[PDB]
Amino acid sequence: AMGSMERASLIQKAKLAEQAERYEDMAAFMKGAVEKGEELSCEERNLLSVAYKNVVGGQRAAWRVLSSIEQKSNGPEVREYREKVETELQGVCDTVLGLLDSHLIKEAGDAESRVFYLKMKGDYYRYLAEVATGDDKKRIIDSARSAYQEAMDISKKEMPPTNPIRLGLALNFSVFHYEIANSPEEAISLAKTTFDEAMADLHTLSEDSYKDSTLIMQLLRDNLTLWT
Amino acid sequence: AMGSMERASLIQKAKLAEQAERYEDMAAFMKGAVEKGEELSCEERNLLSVAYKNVVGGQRAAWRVLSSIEQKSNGPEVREYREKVETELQGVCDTVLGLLDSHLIKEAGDAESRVFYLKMKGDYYRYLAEVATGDDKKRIIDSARSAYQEAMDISKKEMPPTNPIRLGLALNFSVFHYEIANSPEEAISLAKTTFDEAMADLHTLSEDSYKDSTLIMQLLRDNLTLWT
Ligand SMILES: O=C(COc1ccccc1P(=O)(O)O)Nc1cccc(Cl)c1Cl
Ligand SMILES: O=C(COc1ccccc1P(=O)(O)O)Nc1cccc(Cl)c1Cl
Ligand SMILES: [Cl-]
Numbered sequence A, B: 001a002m003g004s005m006e007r008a009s010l011i012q013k014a015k016l017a018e019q020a021e022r023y024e025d026m027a028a029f030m031k032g033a034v035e036k037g038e039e040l041s042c043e044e045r046n047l048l049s050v051a052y053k054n055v056v057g058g059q060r061a062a063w064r065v066l067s068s069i070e071q072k073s074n075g076p077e078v079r080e081y082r083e084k085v086e087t088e089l090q091g092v093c094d095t096v097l098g099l100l101d102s103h104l105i106k107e108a109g110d111a112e113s114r115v116f117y118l119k120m121k122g123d124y125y126r127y128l129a130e131v132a133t134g135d136d137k138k139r140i141i142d143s144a145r146s147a148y149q150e151a152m153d154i155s156k157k158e159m160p161p162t163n164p165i166r167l168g169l170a171l172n173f174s175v176f177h178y179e180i181a182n183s184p185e186e187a188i189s190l191a192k193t194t195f196d197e198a199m200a201d202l203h204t205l206s207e208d209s210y211k212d213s214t215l216i217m218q219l220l221r222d223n224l225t226l227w228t
């Protein structure tokens, strides 16, 4: 439906939608912008991520409420409605994964863009894994793992240890280990090594970069406190 | 789309949607329940009102953000996007007004139901008036006024001055006077008389009814403080 709107108009309206807290509209504007076929700038990548993270975050919160009610009950209505919300969540994840596969990741050559998109691929397979069961669950977990791992490999080679995208990737991959992969030790090791290597590199930063990096380091520390 | 689902299943899912904060789903379930053609119980009327008030409240907040940006700017994008949100808001209001006209109000014979629905009719024409301009604005304002006035007439004849639906009607009609009809004196007079007549009737109430009534009386007092 966004095929007739200018790329720049879609980006302008995504920013308006963010100000209005209209995240479904924001996501649809950014999907239309991606579908124009041009690469995204750093600012535009962040708009894309904010839009979908807010949409899927609402779905995940709803799914958890309904799943909890369903588990306590264990007619068909609670299961039906949890399945409805689950299907819509899966559809959002599949949409984001589709944009990354057609063709954001393959055209992303710079480390900052390529790591950003592979982290997104990890995150959306992670959200699919949260609602998956059984074997099907295994291949989805492995897809998340693989994406995160490729992102980590590039990030370690190409970015300093305080880079916020590198930090955010390591934070989310640590959460994947603790919450999805049943690997709390790997989660704790990753978060601690990431924190310590960032701390050692802070001296190289300006006041503003220091604020950006320490904000995400505090998230790693909050998890380490939750986990130990 | 809800024609195939049982009335009781729609009500059950509206309650699940409320717990999950999925207000658009809640509204669609309650629209389907109304369209079954049976009258609504007190609990079901409240589900209908909560669902739509949350949906339209999100739209009104967005519309205000976009309208403010538009006014400060005074390309077409801000106006286009404000018009999109405005049209969707109007559509929600027209949907609610349609349910009241087909056929909730005409089958509502008891004072508690009839006042509830006429207050809703007042409120949704009020939301249409907030975004209307010009003459068209006049007939919409008069529709809101007329609905509120019929509700007030029944409420004064049929309900005690502490009844929460009577109190809530008077609160919203006072807001209509102050914010829509440019009649701050009528707003203040209504809120003050309503407050005083409720205060005089509190002695007749149980502990729980007293809590219900004084909660809404505090809203009247908060407005009187804002307005004087
Ligand atoms: O509360 C959280 C915390 O999740 C973190 C924390 C650190 C890094 C990444 C995430 P997330 O990508 O949101 O799972 N996420 C969240 C956000 C919205 C809805 C729901 Cl149900 C959840 Cl769990
Ligand atoms: O902040 C309010 C206060 O509105 C009142 C106050 C007392 C009675 C009735 C109402 P309302 O029916 O929400 O206009 N409402 C509101 C609720 C959601 C979005 C927006 Cl923009 C608004 Cl203005
Ligand atoms: Cl359902």
Ligand SMILES: [Cl-]
Pocket (backbone or CB within 6 Å): A106, A107, A108, A109
């Ligand atoms: Cl490339």
Ligand SMILES: [Cl-]
Pocket (backbone or CB within 6 Å): A013, B080, B081, B084
């Ligand atoms: Cl638009």
Ligand SMILES: [Cl-]
Pocket (backbone or CB within 6 Å): B106, B107, B108, B109
């Ligand atoms: Cl009747």
Ligand SMILES: [Mg+2]
Pocket (backbone or CB within 6 Å): A006, A007
């Ligand atoms: Mg063009």
Ligand SMILES: [Mg+2]
Pocket (backbone or CB within 6 Å): A075, A076, A077, B009, B012
């Ligand atoms: Mg049942």
Ligand SMILES: [Mg+2]
Pocket (backbone or CB within 6 Å): A083, A086, A087
């Ligand atoms: Mg399923």
Ligand SMILES: [Mg+2]
Pocket (backbone or CB within 6 Å): A039, A107, A108, A109, A110
């Ligand atoms: Mg490239």
Ligand SMILES: [Mg+2]
Pocket (backbone or CB within 6 Å): A111, A158, A159, A160
């Ligand atoms: Mg580099």
Ligand SMILES: [Mg+2]
Pocket (backbone or CB within 6 Å): B006, B007
């Ligand atoms: Mg039936």
Ligand SMILES: [Mg+2]
Pocket (backbone or CB within 6 Å): A009, A012, B075, B076, B077
């Ligand atoms: Mg422009």
Ligand SMILES: [Mg+2]
Pocket (backbone or CB within 6 Å): B083, B086, B087
């Ligand atoms: Mg218009």
Ligand SMILES: [Mg+2]
Pocket (backbone or CB within 6 Å): B039, B107, B108, B109, B110
């Ligand atoms: Mg009747």
Ligand SMILES: [Mg+2]
Pocket (backbone or CB within 6 Å): B111, B158, B159, B160
């Ligand atoms: Mg009576």
